[model samples]
Target: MSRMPSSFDVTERDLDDMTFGERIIYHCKKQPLVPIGCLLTTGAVILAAQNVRLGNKWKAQYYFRWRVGLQAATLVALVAGSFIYGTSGKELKAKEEQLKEKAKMREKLWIQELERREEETEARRKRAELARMKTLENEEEIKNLEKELSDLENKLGKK
Candidate 1:
């Protein structure tokens, strides 16, 4: 009886030791878009080849033309987007810094306002305490005056 072949095992490769082809394959496997784009391009080519083999020359020609046009448009869009972002990225950074500075200034102002309010409240409380103390002293002085008047009247009656 013949033995069946075992499945091939894949081991991780070192970047420094990997060949050019290995590196390409490794990166293609890691990046989803790379594989997807590869599959799409491969499929388009295969479709055209199959159409040609089946004797459909016009269809194959049409497929190639359409694929080429779409690829060109995708390239243009990518370039334009990269260019716009390159210019706008610096502007965005500056704006972000300005906003951070404004926020810090606002926070400092808020803290100062809070401190001012606290001081005002403390002053008001001190003024109220002073007023209360003055009232108490006035009441005691009136009591002393009434007692002196009563004593003088008593002395006069005795005389």
Candidate 2:
């Protein structure tokens, strides 16, 4: 009997495992209208501002009306598009927050782990120096100069 290929297997489970930010970026690419609307709104605002700056009251009024109308329309479009986008933006924001929290937890854990390892290593080094002194019986002090070495090693490891 022929064995089935496991490599070809694709499942919805894989999609569920993806971070929401990743999914949002993927979906955003599929819909370009959101950014386009933003661009148009920006243009309208700029034109309105320019008109007002020129002190042309009538022109400014006209531009202001158009700008406001365009902004309102763009908002409506954004709301409608959100229905189709289906919480992608929200999911992306939520995922970002989750990642930030996870990173903080990891940082705390790393600091704790580093402190523990350092304490353990110091104890080991002290024991080693004690051993050397007893065996050698030399008049020279077995200089406990490991602090410098430990600092260098610690920096290298952290970076």
Candidate 3:
């Protein structure tokens, strides 16, 4: 049976596969299309105003018929674009939240790792101290035994 890889594996794979520039471009491309629609609408508005200045009401009306049609189309496009923009913005926000959560988790894990290392170091230091104390105790016991033997020898000699 095949097993599913862990989240860490997936994260590492993504990091290894994606470049920073590619990610930046991808994110920038995800922005709303409102600016393009707004530009188109602004251009049409300028043309309509110019037409009104250059011609009579009838001619301007004629110009406005076409201009208004263009305006309407622009409005529709703008509305649709706005909707798409909103949705894209929401998706990007959700992704940002996810990224933030991941960062927090990583920071917590790093702190825990540091704590674990500190505990291990403390345990090692205590073990070394205990070993040193044992060595000192053994030396003192040996010196005491040697002194008693010398005293016994002196007593025998006096007898």
Candidate 4:
């Protein structure tokens, strides 16, 4: 319970606010192809040199070529990501946050549906009981009442 008469608008907010490293990770996550090949390129480069230091240009050539190809791939990915995302890179995070709003509404609507069905189930039981209790002499009327109940159940099932 807050008894605060504070002026500064409650001031505390974070849904896992990113730290500096996390900021890097977030960008890496968003533009995955660009970042992954970057790390992959460095690994190839390092392995290429390490193999050269050992007495082997056979495997070294392979690794060094791997480094070169990855660097080339990385260049293409960087350009592609830049072209695709462009200024909307800023709005990219916004879209993710906006997704939360739609997701919440789905959750709310699902709960509403659950409650509606619960109420409907109770009412169905009562309605069926009452329909049965109606006059036995009016066969068509009771028959159609039960028919409509089954029809309603089928309709909702199809829904």
My TM-score estimates for the predictions, one after another, are 0.19, 0.20, 0.19, 0.22
Over 1-159, each residue of candidate 2 has an lDDT whose tens digit, in order, gives: 012221222232322232221333333243335554455335434533453355554453446556644664464355456656776768645645765575456455335423476555565555554433211222111122222333544565763
CA lDDT of each prediction against the hidden true structure:
0.41, 0.42, 0.42, 0.41
* Candidate 1 ranges with C-alpha deviation above 4 Å: 1-120, 123-132
- Please give, for residues 1-159, the per-residue lDDT of candidate 4 as tens digits: 122221221111211121112233333343245554466335434433453345453453335546644564464346456545676665556644654565455455435423476555565555554433111233233334334434544565664
Worst 10 residues of 1 by lDDT: 14-23
| Backbone steric clashes in candidate 2, count | 0
Worst 10 residues of 2 by lDDT: 134-143
Off by over 4 Å in 4: 1-84, 109-159
What is the alpha-carbon lDDT for the whole of candidate 4? 0.41
Identify the superior model by lDDT, candidate 1 or candidate 2.
Answer: 2
- What C-alpha lDDT, on a 0 to 100 scale, does residue 145 get in candidate 2? 22
TM-score of 4: 0.22
Tell me how candidate 2 scores on lDDT: 0.42
